[PDB]
């Protein structure tokens, strides 16, 4: 009965579509409208259930450890495998480089995963002791736990941001300096903006094009388009030696 989950190729289709829609929003110059009505673009029914609320870049040794906003934890290891620990303290899911998923438990698991389990526990403990939870102000909706828990598909960092791409399609961009964050959902064609005051607001992209938005959000969306391009192909299709 279990769903196989949205497959990565299907995620890539929606990503390309979001790339195109970001281009369209951005080319519409949304901060230049006669009267910007950003509030009218809000779409509360499309609020994301999941985002990365904490992260640790130990990629020099092991990988990128993270917490999701339901307090589950995961790691994308340097061998492109993922281990996630659900918020019950014991349930695990292991995802191989090719996406093959297996379910296990901390109490009952193949011995082959002992090392990666122990590393995940170290990441968890670190995050819990040291790091602030992003979106700690959002109270979950009833049944949000029924949505498929995603894993971190890919990530990268620039000088100004970290880019986190989840297996449900979402692309999260966290800006280092000012703590502002974007959560782009290519399935809902929506974007959530977390501003410097920690206000969390979810917009329909097509409505940002219709109604406009402030220049800070407009600026972050220009950068987002560039990040999506990089995600889709780290190297340019017009010159594969050149970084997207």
């Amino acid at each position: 009965l279990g769903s196989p989950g949205i497959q990565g190729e299907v995620v890539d289709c929606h990503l390309s579509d979001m790339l195109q829609q970001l281009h369209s929003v951005n080319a519409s110059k949304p901060s230049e409208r006669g009267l910007v009505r950003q509030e009218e673009a809000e779409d509360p029914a499309c609020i994301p259930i999941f985002w990365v609320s904490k992260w640790v870049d130990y990629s020099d040794k092991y990988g990128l450890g993270y917490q999701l906003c339901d307090n589950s934890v995961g790691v994308l290891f340097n061998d492109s495998t993922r281990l996630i620990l659900y918020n019950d303290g014991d349930s695990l899911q292991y995802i191989e480089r090719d996406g093959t998923e297996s379910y296990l438990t901390v109490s009952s698991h193949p011995n082959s995963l002992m090392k990666k389990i122990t590393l995940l526990k170290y990441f968890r403990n670190y995050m819990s002791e040291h790091l602030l939870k992003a979106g700690a102000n959002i109270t979950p909706r009833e049944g949000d736990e029924l949505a498929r828990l995603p894993y971190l598909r890919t990530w990268f960092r620039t000088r100004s941001a970290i880019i986190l791409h989840l297996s449900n399609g979402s692309v999260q961009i966290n800006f280092f300096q000012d703590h502002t964050k974007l959560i782009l959902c290519p399935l809902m064609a929506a974007v959530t903006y977390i501003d410097e005051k920690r206000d969390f607001r979810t917009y329909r992209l097509s409505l940002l094009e219709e109604y406009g938005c402030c220049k800070e959000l407009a600026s972050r969306l220009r950068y987002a388009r560039t990040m999506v391009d990089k995600l889709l192909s780290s190297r340019s299709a017009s010159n594969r030696l050149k970084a997207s």
Partner: peptide, 8 residues
């Protein structure tokens, strides 16, 4: 660049 998300 920072090696973690925002600290407590």
């Amino acid at each position: 660049g920072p090696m973690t998300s925002t600290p407590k």
